[PDB]
């Protein structure tokens, strides 16, 4: 009897917003994959990591119509009782996989400006594919547990495919939702701080085009914070009522859960702005 409910205001927000993001997501990341496969004449180590970033976003954009149909049925999973776990495993894997390949690019850019002579900058394509394959391995390590757990809680006659329910339990999925964001913020922000400082200490900033390069190092951090921070702060807010003054009354959870469910739409926006900021902007 965990806190699960639905409202009508979200039905006037999510179906238009989620559908609109799907149009931009498919045209953006779909076109980006076209250039990588048939227009990139030299596949270096740096472009390999960026390619995986587009694959993760595309695997999430293709699943946007399925989750969109969930709301239009008044929050009812009409079909796919077993695919409910599948359609949710493909969502957390894409979200976490995008973050992992988002920090790697930031880490890769850090080693090219602060340690120009390091041997890591000259790794061959294969070595950049063995590392990339191992990164995909750890993505499913923290996500395949969705299949083991049972899902589709029945509210009498309705079906809801939700794993972010506001119920007082030490769930690994909820805890991993907080580690997937705080830890990269301690690496992405730190790496982007030295890149925007080493390029300034050595006076390379002035009288060069590199001003644009410094600008887009901060743009990446801005997009990451805007897309993921609001979802986290409303998740921690739920934990406050869950730990103290909660677990009994479901009315206090109504406001936060509705905000959390809507704020989750911020996450599928980083999969739309990534081709605009990462690939297309760069020459
Ligand atoms: C909205 C939702 C979803 C996913 C697939 C099918 C229905 C609903 O997306 C997530 C997620 O982004 O991880 C958790 C969900 O409950």
Residue numbers in the entry: 17 to 299
From the paper:
The hydroxycarboxylic acid receptor (HCA) family consists of the typical metabolism-sensing receptors present in humans and belongs to the class A GPCRs. Agonists were revealed to form a salt bridge with arginine, which is conserved in the HCA family, to activate these receptors. Extracellular regions of the receptors form a lid-like structure that covers the ligand-binding pocket.
By local refinement covering only the TM domain on cryoSPARC22, we obtained clear and continuous density maps of the entire receptor part, including the isolated ligand densities and extracellular regions. Similar to the acifran-bound HCA2 structure, Y284 and R111 form a polar interaction with the carboxylic group of acifran. In addition, the aromatic ring of acifran is surrounded by a hydrophobic pocket formed by V832.60, Y862.64, W93ECL1, L1043.29, F1073.32, and I178ECL2. The amino acids with the most notable difference in the ligand binding pocket of HCA3 are V832.60 (L83 in HCA2), Y862.64 (N86), S91ECL1 (W91), and V1033.28 (M103). The aromatic ring of acifran forms a hydrophobic interaction with W91 in HCA2, and Y86 plays a similar role in HCA3. On the other hand, in HCA3, pocket I cannot stably hold the aromatic ring of acifran due to the larger volume, consistent with a 10-fold decrease in affinity. Replacement of W91ECL1 in HCA2 with Ser shifts F2777.36 closer to the ligand-binding pocket in HCA3 than in HCA2, and the distance between Y872.64 and Y2847.43 in pocket II is slightly closer.
